[PDB]
Structure 1
């Protein structure tokens, strides 16, 4: 099972930026316009049209992947072997593999 993580996005009180593609598994990034965001008791990081948003996304393996995980295999004939218990004449039970 996978898991998606997201770094903290970046905004600006004015102007705009552009996001770049990085070499990551199913990397994503995009920009949005006219945010006028909000914060706790804050000035809300805006005075005008914001047009700043990063919202990048990121995919990687889960932390529990170490335990449960399917595996695929290719199969060919391989060997054959067994074990045998033996007794003859008066000798007792003797066992060995072959």
Structure 2
């Protein structure tokens, strides 16, 4: 039986970022633009998409 690791998502906010491959097994990567993170403290950054 296996266990899927879900490391904390990287956020490059009010900027641009690109995916990078790695060596870990089953590694799957994907970027998303227009996201808008929110947290208990509030908006974690400042830019419309």
TM-score under structure 1 length normalisation: 0.44
2: CA distance between counterparts of 1:8 and 1:48? 22
**Unpaired runs of at least 5, structure 2:** none
Q: Whose strand proportion is higher, 1 or 2?
A: 1
Give the greater-gyration-radius structure (CA).
Answer: 1
Give the corresponding residue for 1:29: 29
Q: Matches of residues 69-84 of structure 1 in structure 2 within 5 Å? A: none
Q: How many residues align?
A: 49
TM-score under structure 2 length normalisation: 0.77
**Unpaired runs of at least 5, structure 1:** 50-98
Q: Matches of residues 5-84 of structure 1 in structure 2 within 5 Å? A: 5-49=5-49
**Structure 1 2/48 Cα, relative in aligned 2: closer, same or farther at 3 Å?**
same
Q: Which has the higher contact order (CA 8 A, sep 6+)?
A: 2
Deviation, structure 1 residue 42: 2.1
2: CA distance between counterparts of 1:43 and 1:28? 27
